[PDB]
Amino acid sequence: MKMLKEKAGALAGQIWEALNGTEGLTQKQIKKATKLKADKDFFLGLGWLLREDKVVTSEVEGEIFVKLVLEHHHHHH
Amino acid sequence: MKMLKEKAGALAGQIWEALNGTEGLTQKQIKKATKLKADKDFFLGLGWLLREDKVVTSEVEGEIFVKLVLEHHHHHH
Description:
The structure is a homodimer. By secondary structure, the first copy, chain A, is of the alpha+beta class. Chain A has one domain: Winged helix-like DNA-binding domain superfamily/Winged helix DNA-binding domain (Arc Repressor Mutant, subunit A, Orthogonal Bundle). Helices cover 48% and strands 16% of the residues of chain A. The first copy, chain A, contains 3 helices and 2 strands, in the order αααββ. Chain A has helices spanning 4-19, 27-34, 39-51; strands at 55-60, 63-68. Chain A has a two-stranded antiparallel sheet. Chain A is globular and about 40 Å long. Chain A starts with a helix and ends in a 9-residue tail after the last strand. Chains A and B meet through helix 1, helix 3 and strand 1 of A and helix 1, helix 3 and strand 2 of B. Chains A, B: This is Winged helix-turn-helix domain-containing protein. Chains A, B: It holds the Pfam family DUF2582. Chains A, B: It comes from Phocaeicola vulgatus (strain ATCC 8482 / DSM 1447 / JCM 5826 / CCUG 4940 / NBRC 14291 / NCTC 11154) (Bacteroides vulgatus). Chains A, B: InterPro entries: DUF2582, WH-like_DNA-bd_sf. It is classed as structural genomics, unknown function.
Protein backbone atom coordinates (compact mmCIF):
# COMPACT_ATOMS: atom_id res chain seq x y z
CA MET A 1 0.00 0.00 0.00
CA LYS A 2 2.20 2.87 -1.41
CA MET A 3 0.30 6.21 -1.80
CA LEU A 4 0.77 9.07 -4.35
CA LYS A 5 0.89 11.22 -1.09
CA GLU A 6 4.41 9.83 -0.23
CA LYS A 7 5.48 10.80 -3.80
CA ALA A 8 3.93 14.33 -3.32
CA GLY A 9 5.93 14.70 -0.05
CA ALA A 10 9.28 13.94 -1.81
CA LEU A 11 8.26 16.49 -4.55
CA ALA A 12 7.41 19.03 -1.77
CA GLY A 13 10.96 18.76 -0.33
CA GLN A 14 12.88 19.52 -3.59
CA ILE A 15 10.41 22.36 -4.62
CA TRP A 16 10.79 23.99 -1.14
CA GLU A 17 14.66 23.65 -1.43
CA ALA A 18 14.46 25.37 -4.91
CA LEU A 19 12.54 28.30 -3.28
CA ASN A 20 15.03 28.18 -0.32
CA GLY A 21 18.03 30.55 -0.94
CA THR A 22 16.04 32.78 -3.41
CA GLU A 23 13.41 35.58 -3.09
CA GLY A 24 10.96 33.86 -5.55
CA LEU A 25 10.73 31.89 -8.88
CA THR A 26 7.98 31.23 -11.56
CA GLN A 27 6.85 27.69 -12.74
CA LYS A 28 9.69 27.44 -15.40
CA GLN A 29 12.49 28.57 -12.93
CA ILE A 30 11.16 26.26 -10.11
CA LYS A 31 11.05 23.12 -12.39
CA LYS A 32 14.56 24.19 -13.64
CA ALA A 33 16.10 24.33 -10.08
CA THR A 34 14.24 21.12 -8.90
CA LYS A 35 15.11 19.08 -12.09
CA LEU A 36 11.28 18.43 -12.55
CA LYS A 37 10.82 16.78 -16.01
CA ALA A 38 7.06 17.70 -15.92
CA ASP A 39 4.74 20.37 -14.33
CA LYS A 40 2.56 17.36 -13.17
CA ASP A 41 4.94 16.79 -10.19
CA PHE A 42 5.09 20.60 -9.51
CA PHE A 43 1.29 20.75 -8.78
CA LEU A 44 1.37 17.88 -6.14
CA GLY A 45 4.53 19.21 -4.37
CA LEU A 46 3.36 22.90 -4.45
CA GLY A 47 0.00 21.92 -2.86
CA TRP A 48 1.92 20.36 0.06
CA LEU A 49 3.82 23.71 0.55
CA LEU A 50 0.38 25.45 0.63
CA ARG A 51 -0.94 23.01 3.37
CA GLU A 52 1.93 24.01 5.76
CA ASP A 53 1.81 27.73 4.63
CA LYS A 54 5.57 27.63 3.73
CA VAL A 55 4.86 29.49 0.39
CA VAL A 56 2.55 32.05 -1.28
CA THR A 57 1.20 31.54 -4.87
CA SER A 58 -0.02 34.12 -7.45
CA GLU A 59 -0.11 34.72 -11.25
CA VAL A 60 2.55 36.87 -13.02
CA GLU A 61 2.20 37.21 -16.87
CA GLY A 62 0.47 33.73 -17.08
CA GLU A 63 3.18 32.02 -14.92
CA ILE A 64 2.57 30.41 -11.47
CA PHE A 65 4.90 32.65 -9.35
CA VAL A 66 5.73 31.01 -5.96
CA LYS A 67 7.95 32.13 -2.98
CA LEU A 68 8.53 31.40 0.78
CA VAL A 69 6.25 33.41 3.21
CA LEU A 70 8.48 36.31 4.45
CA GLU A 71 5.72 39.02 4.44
CA HIS A 72 1.92 39.48 3.65
CA HIS A 73 0.79 39.97 -0.05
CA HIS A 74 -2.51 41.38 -1.53
CA HIS A 75 -1.41 40.60 -5.18
CA HIS A 76 -4.95 39.43 -6.22
CA HIS A 77 -4.28 37.67 -9.59
CA MET B 1 -6.42 38.78 -1.59
CA LYS B 2 -7.32 36.26 -4.39
CA MET B 3 -4.28 33.87 -4.57
CA LEU B 4 -3.59 30.62 -6.56
CA LYS B 5 -3.81 28.94 -3.08
CA GLU B 6 -7.33 30.43 -2.66
CA LYS B 7 -8.65 28.88 -5.96
CA ALA B 8 -7.00 25.53 -4.90
CA GLY B 9 -9.15 25.59 -1.71
CA ALA B 10 -12.26 26.74 -3.69
CA LEU B 11 -12.02 23.80 -6.20
CA ALA B 12 -11.54 21.26 -3.32
CA GLY B 13 -15.31 21.58 -2.60
CA GLN B 14 -16.50 20.54 -6.14
CA ILE B 15 -13.69 17.86 -6.57
CA TRP B 16 -14.95 16.30 -3.26
CA GLU B 17 -18.63 16.57 -4.51
CA ALA B 18 -17.72 14.48 -7.63
CA LEU B 19 -16.36 11.76 -5.23
CA ASN B 20 -19.42 12.22 -2.88
CA GLY B 21 -21.89 9.26 -3.23
CA THR B 22 -19.50 7.23 -5.52
CA GLU B 23 -16.99 4.29 -5.19
CA GLY B 24 -14.38 6.83 -6.44
CA LEU B 25 -13.84 8.51 -9.88
CA THR B 26 -10.91 9.10 -12.27
CA GLN B 27 -9.41 12.58 -13.07
CA LYS B 28 -11.52 12.89 -16.32
CA GLN B 29 -14.82 11.76 -14.61
CA ILE B 30 -14.33 14.46 -11.88
CA LYS B 31 -13.18 17.13 -14.46
CA LYS B 32 -16.40 16.46 -16.49
CA ALA B 33 -18.68 16.59 -13.35
CA THR B 34 -16.96 19.84 -12.08
CA LYS B 35 -16.92 21.59 -15.57
CA LEU B 36 -13.08 22.17 -15.41
CA LYS B 37 -11.72 23.30 -18.86
CA ALA B 38 -8.01 22.65 -17.98
CA ASP B 39 -6.87 19.54 -15.95
CA LYS B 40 -4.09 21.76 -14.38
CA ASP B 41 -6.78 23.16 -11.94
CA PHE B 42 -7.89 19.59 -10.85
CA PHE B 43 -4.42 18.86 -9.26
CA LEU B 44 -4.73 21.97 -6.98
CA GLY B 45 -8.26 20.87 -5.81
CA LEU B 46 -7.21 17.18 -5.35
CA GLY B 47 -4.03 18.36 -3.53
CA TRP B 48 -6.25 20.07 -0.91
CA LEU B 49 -8.12 16.71 -0.44
CA LEU B 50 -4.67 15.05 0.12
CA ARG B 51 -3.50 17.79 2.61
CA GLU B 52 -6.38 16.89 5.05
CA ASP B 53 -6.33 13.10 4.12
CA LYS B 54 -10.14 13.12 3.32
CA VAL B 55 -9.36 10.92 0.20
CA VAL B 56 -7.28 7.85 -0.93
CA THR B 57 -5.22 7.89 -4.24
CA SER B 58 -4.53 5.04 -6.77
CA GLU B 59 -3.49 4.64 -10.47
CA VAL B 60 -5.76 2.91 -13.07
CA GLU B 61 -3.93 2.11 -16.40
CA GLY B 62 -1.67 5.26 -16.24
CA GLU B 63 -4.61 7.57 -15.26
CA ILE B 64 -5.32 9.18 -11.80
CA PHE B 65 -8.01 7.37 -9.73
CA VAL B 66 -9.17 8.83 -6.36
CA LYS B 67 -11.87 7.86 -3.79
CA LEU B 68 -13.15 9.25 -0.40
CA VAL B 69 -11.20 7.79 2.65
CA LEU B 70 -14.58 6.76 4.31
CA GLU B 71 -14.52 2.91 3.69
CA HIS B 72 -13.09 0.04 1.45
CA HIS B 73 -15.42 -1.66 -1.15
CA HIS B 74 -12.35 -3.40 -2.77
CA HIS B 75 -13.75 -5.44 -5.73
CA HIS B 76 -11.23 -6.52 -8.50
CA HIS B 77 -7.73 -4.77 -8.70
